[PDB]
């Protein structure tokens, strides 16, 4: 916090840039050393930095990821937190802001100069507050240091009138009474950089690679790890990502979008269950979802029931999910053809074919329509329960205890719901 | 002073869908509702090098050792079946209407002047030259892009779909209707008047365009190829991916729209190409050259500024091009 | 210089070790999440006589079922091995960076 | 907000290039702001003439196909793009990656007003469907169903039931009609209580991290994966203010110069794809707007869910 | 100056289909439309080590320990049935025309110069030498690649298909018509004038080429082969839908085997028309660019600086323009 050591640090940094240019210069003639030591070695480099602060800008929400021929206004704005619970984004960054920089890529020497952590903090925040060590180390004149401060503090101030381009997005939002607001959203590069760093740390970090070794060795570990499936890479600069922002050079494009996908985003096809007789075990149970569901029940049905509520709610919602995928299987099977049980056979599940093909009633007006409306074919739930009791293990310790009675109770409860849904199929 | 709007945005009128291609036999085109879909499958290719050497790698050792290490690609290929010689390409077209009304306009002065200018056009000469050419590019199957270049017979069927059914049906010989002459015809004039009444009215006109092309047994059909950057590592890389909606090959909707917009025979360069697509700074992606440059006063921005701002109305051809851009859509506007 | 167990670090998410009463039967998760309940596209296979379960021998310990799974993945399915290879290379570059 | 007097059902609408990029952090199904803005545009375009107030939308998504591809040797996905026109000099334009997805959603619209009495139910259902056929739902065209087996019609279900059994009966009759999909709701109480649990685990936790924790599949040591209650997707649940509210003719290059502009920023909340018979009342699960514009915080959710 | 264009994309003329292979008995070749297709099936093979040892594996304990545990595999094999001795390979071939026109070209003046060059070629000499050799490669069943080498009698039936029916039908003996001499026949000249009328744009030509090869009962046939992603699966064969097939680019490569004009010896006979005319089997590129006889130097002298090559070399150049390709620099 003495001005002499900060003077030593700034002259040391510009002398490091001097030896950097004289190392990556490869000059032997033309006398570039004179103009090189006249430009980047004296205190006129700070005058050129006070010129170059106007080209750069510390930004938190830039507009350049929206279509890059959009010359709008970028913001270093931190939003206030919602009082409403649940949702949040980009105001959660309290000390973990990365403070993106847009502008010229050859002008980033000013940002490398501002990113120094010389005493205990950045020189930026030292230039915000009034201090004696500030405004005196980098000068010998007072008013020149004042105008240098007013130049150097302007990297966090938005330049120009507020503007969002025609290529930028702006979207009407209806107020509760009769109004609209324009709502031009900006791209959060600091939030994307924080989520990108979190994802790279959870996937490639040392504490994650250690638990990844411990699962591949099948050993035990203190902590676990994470996967983040179904990510999508969205790149912003095509072949030149430097023109979008500074942080889009660290992540070369690579937005790393999270999957907000519906569960029927892998919808394979529907095949009419012709050559079988127990559709819950051949075409329904062969689906990739209910196999995982029944295996998770088989894991969850043979254990200690001391955690009665937590295991009981899990088994109830799992049986609800299995009867749910049964109802979705019967629902999506109605797009096949109106008649496929009319295709002749001998063993084709003639009690479940009253359920999975209701459009034979449109063809057989009195022959097959009146045989499912008076019977109301809903004994399918009992066969569904006989299929679902193959998920429980054949253990006498599971049979004698109250676990079998509680399992049968909530299983019959969800089967009452599923059968009551199948009861009123005719409205 | 009537400056230009800083935000201009016209929606896309003439909004097609993905052209589903299926397959069967000619002389049962009338029962082509259960024709099986052309599926996109993979095949393996192995090729030698054929691109130009860069005058430093022309020596025979490197060339002969480079034909011993060939590139091995898995490409997507869509073919007709070996018992089907006819390709049925089917899509739907919505002709929306409200063709001069912008979806976004800053200035109410510029908006009112542009609506006054568009209404002056429509009363002076309606959508009858534009929709005639749109009906041509429907009638000749220009949307069959490479699926047309060797066909024995192309036949386009267009059905005006009203509230539940076909209100009025057309049927064209798409090879008699050329890809370069926007002539006159009675049924083309009826279809043009329908596309005009769609582009004028407040509601959409829905058409069902089906084009059968008698290619040959087992021949290759050419659906749209997908713009996939980052194909990945070269081992399991699929070097060509063909577009297909649901296990059924297809042409992209913007490719069908690009074929429908090919009405522009008004650009100042000579018509060795004939019609090109209506674009601001009218630029053919296959030619790599932008006609209608701003160094001449014949692009869409200069003509729209002269027509709306200072009332220098162009000729009827260039104002056809301007209103065709307004039907085409686009995001215009300066900073 | 990326070793084999660092590739196994990201290859082990493609396997699933289901518990049976005899032992541990490994399988293959095609979506790479260890056989998760919702995001997990597990690979089920058709065997000789009505076998619809995980491709994998019922091993006594999880240490050997996972090892047989990794050996199967290394022998036969080299696309998931290339996935795990590029994951391991990006992890090594990440520790070279951060 | 206010309860729907009736519940209109737009049937399975096919959208061909919807915005797969929901937000800067999420891809997949488009944001619920797209659907709420579509239903406000339906109100703005046909609802002010039928004297009804179309408010609240329930999103179902029978079929979803994203135009994505998985590159070779990569675990993640990239987007299949479109080839834009050239520049005026003949070069290829700079590629801006947009995600396109083919949807098949059916919308449940909350309808309330005095126009329910003045008009038949099928008339206003037909009018909002014939107006929706000329519209777009997330940037993608609504395919208008020509020459299939039969066109899917509407049904405006009056939520006022004479009895509770009849009300449960026609909720079942509507749920059976929108069954092969998965209704999208908002679970932000679950996000907050998961944040509270993660804060009792480790202090100084943000609910961005709790949202991520509900997104991942966590592997746990004794190995087992941590189970989840439902599908639990991340959705953009609105906007948060970055700038103060600017006057209409004050900001530069706005959409219109008669509406106050304010630079905003996404607010990622939690969603949950559940089947429509798990709600037991379809007059819930409808997505409304909540502005509170003096604070910022322009957001959508489905209140009255649980 | 008239430099060459940076894009040049010629569409492929002479489009063949995937050559489906069926299987039946000779002397009922005429009723060969219900012939069951050759199915690709799997057999397990097991071979001892037979490759060259790299001077370190010549340790006898290492050699015997590698022989004691040989590699098991599972190849895809396609055979004729044991009661069927004939292989029917059936494709269609569409001759398009418009050969000098490119599908993509930056320069308009270069495209005009190239079109004038190809037009002066066609006016001086049509597609009459080219279509003669293409008709030969249809007539001698060179598209039967290894299905031809030990066949007792190969017979090709080429049908020109107008409207929907057979307009003019040829029937050749593919073993009397050799693989290396382009002689003259009346029916070969009729097929050549048809392929000429197709390649000039003066008609629509869709040929259907059926080739019967009398191999033997139960013998092995050789469809096209895919690249592969104990049971190592060392060979994967092509098939469209449970029916073995040859790739269409293999059929087209056999149809382009007309280039008898390369500067080396004529002992090999014709090779395929490729720029830097290369054979993958022999590992050698004839028409190297160091001699001035590859496609690019001949084209850039014929079009840019008006140095018209020899008549056979411009036959080769227009055969490349019929062939297709992605020409043009970066």
Residue numbers in the entry:
A (entry chain A): 8 to 434
B (entry chain I): 24 to 358
C (entry chain J): 3 to 100
D (entry chain B): 3 to 224, 239 to 322
E (entry chain H): 24 to 252, 258 to 358
Q: What does the article say, verbatim?
A:
The Csy complex is composed of four Cas proteins including Cas5f, Cas6f, Cas7f and Cas8f in a stoichiometry of 1:1:6:1, and a 60-nt crRNA that integrates all these protein subunits. Consistent with previously reported structures, the Csy complex adopts a helically twisted ‘G’ shape with Cas5f, Cas6f, Cas7f and Cas8f protein components integrated by the crRNA. Target DNA binding and R-loop formation induce conformational changes in the Csy complex, enabling it to recruit the Cas2/3 nuclease for degradation of the invading MGEs. Here, we report the cryo-EM structures of three type I-F Acr proteins, AcrIF4, AcrIF7 and AcrIF14, bound to the type I-F CRISPR–Cas surveillance complex (the Csy complex) from Pseudomonas aeruginosa.
AcrIF4 is a 100-residue protein from the JBD5 phage composed of a helical domain and a β-strand domain. AcrIF4 is clamped between the spiral backbone of the Csy complex and Cas8f. The β-strand domain of AcrIF4 fits against helix α1 of Cas8fHB. In the middle, D20 and P21 of AcrIF4 engage R299 and R302 of the helix α1 of Cas8fHB by a salt bridge and a hydrogen bond, respectively. On one side, F54 of AcrIF4 forms a cation-pi stacking interaction with R293 of Cas8fHB; on the other side, L39 of AcrIF4 forms hydrophobic interactions with L300 and L325 of Cas8fHB. The helical domain of AcrIF4 interacts with Cas8fmid through a network of contacts including three salt bridges (AcrIF4-D8:Cas8fmid-K216, AcrIF4-D89:Cas8fmid-R210, and AcrIF4-R97:Cas8f-D213) and extensive hydrogen bonds. Target DNA binding to the Csy complex induces a 180° rotation of Cas8fHB, which is essential for recruitment of the Cas2/3 nuclease for cleavage of the substrate. These interactions observed between AcrIF4 and Cas8fHB indicate that AcrIF4 may prevent the rotation of Cas8fHB, thereby locking the Csy complex in an inactive state. Structural comparison between the Csy-AcrF4 and Csy-target dsDNA suggest that AcrF4 does not compete with PAM recognition or hybridization between crRNA and the target strand of dsDNA. Consistent with this observation, electromobility shift assays (EMSAs) showed that the Csy complex was able to bind to dsDNA substrate in the presence of AcrIF4. Third, AcrIF4 primarily binds to the Cas8fHB, a binding site that was not reported in other AcrIF proteins.
